[PDB]
Write a protein that binds this ligand. Structure first.
Ligand SMILES: Nc1ccn([C@H]2C[C@H](O)[C@@H](COP(=O)(O)OP(=O)(O)O)O2)c(=O)n1
Ligand SMILES: Nc1ccn([C@H]2C[C@H](O)[C@@H](COP(=O)(O)OP(=O)(O)O)O2)c(=O)n1
Ligand SMILES: [Mg+2]
Lengths: 226, 227
């Protein structure tokens, strides 16, 4: 097998999808084959489609998913609203393992946070990471509260021996502001800050997004994910 | 001793201070002597003063602070900005142990989340709760993301054997939207939900706030918090 990473966030709207696209785009420019899997997608009625973002922004074509619910709620609530069940644990783990292959970087994007229910009954992206022996990239904010949330997610990961592959500041404000700059320094004291992605990068076209992504990550670290 | 409760939250601005005032008010109405302490206060140069607000809202007079920093940042960054030190771990425990007394409910409000650094090195409100053998009342939102934050916070508490006293939904909207309602039912399955304080409770006057506090909690739970 190759390399599998779960891309998780300290919360909702922290930039997980932009970070999947940014790391995919950088790995692709490093000559690395990339797949992104998003097992469960919500908010389809208003048009949320995270795989399509990665496709447009990064150019990934191996884009794999299992379920789509209309309501903009957490998976289990959106499923109950529609009157249908979440996918099974086995579907998710086997899908990801089939995507995985030597030389390929496989990114798994969950929904919202580390401990939200992804599959019936009560299986989370942490459970999925355990099952596929994946490491975890943690997307954080740079705003007030992020040190607590980061440390909480990092403890949850270690408790199930899910290795932390680093942090990414999903959105970096312009201009920074005194909270953000202080938090960037403090985040780097509790784990590796792999990138801070400029605010608004999701509006970029494919070429500008590729340029941004190539600069946003250290060259050696990406190539070494393998 | 009496009963010590640390009041912590899933994030900043979730209503820890309103909850302290509200639980204090309900305990006071039950005849229970209440003390509220705030070991680390930041933002004082914009008027941030949680003890003073608990006093305004619930009439609590036994209020105890220790560290105060001007800038509205995490305690560690607010100290650095002012050229001051964080308190030592034993200074926080002394502040709480001096208030602890039989028949008294002593509330300890944290500083913006359970693992925020309160003392050096990396000492948190969770360590303090271990030191004073307090349980933790966890204040949460009803908006999306609360289930993840709540479970991460509850796992962190169990990891150091700090008992969870239950959940308080800090701000409860009227009317409740679909997500709030779904989160509330799901939070109830994660731990006991002790209260869901109506949004905008900070604008109630002393009478209305105290009536809201009486209704907000189960009297049997309040009265059972301390003999
Ligand atoms: N560097 C960034 C990060 C997020 N954004 C935008 C993109 C979206 O509109 C919001 C939230 O980002 P995103 O959809 O990736 O958040 P989650 O996948 O839910 O974690 O912020 C951006 O434009 N530039
Ligand atoms: N049930 C509630 C909860 C919060 N508020 C107001 C009061 C404040 O202006 C903000 C934040 O609440 P609070 O100061 O207690 O938040 P934290 O102590 O930082 O957790 O919301 C309210 O009016 N009614
Ligand atoms: Mg407060």
């Amino acid at each position: 097998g190759g390399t599998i990473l779960v891309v998780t966030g300290t919360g909702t709207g922290v930039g997980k999808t932009v970070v999947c696209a940014a790391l995919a785009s950088a790995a692709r420019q490093a000559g690395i084959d990339v797949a992104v899997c998003k097992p469960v997608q919500t908010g389809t009625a208003r048009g949320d489609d995270d795989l399509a973002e990665v496709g447009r922004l990064a150019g990934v074509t191996q884009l794999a998913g299992l379920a789509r619910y209309p309501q903009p709620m957490a998976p289990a609530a959106a499923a109950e609203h529609a009157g249908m069940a979440l996918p099974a644990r086995d579907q998710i783990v086997r899908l990801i393992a089939d995507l995985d292959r030597p030389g390929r970087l496989t990114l798994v994007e969950g929904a919202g946070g580390l401990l939200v229910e992804l599959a019936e009954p009560g299986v989370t992206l942490r459970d999925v990471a355990v099952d596929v022996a994946a490491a975890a990239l943690v997307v954080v904010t740079a705003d007030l509260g992020t040190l607590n949330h980061t440390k909480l997610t990092l403890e949850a990961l270690a408790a199930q021996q899910v290795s932390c592959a680093g942090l990414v500041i999903g959105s970096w404000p312009d201009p920074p502001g005194l909270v953000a700059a202080s938090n960037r320094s403090a985040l780097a004291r509790i784990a590796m800050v792999r990138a801070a992605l400029p605010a608004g990068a999701a509006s970029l076209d494919a070429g500008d997004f590729a340029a941004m992504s190539a600069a946003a990550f250290d060259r050696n670290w990406v190539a070494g994910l393998v």
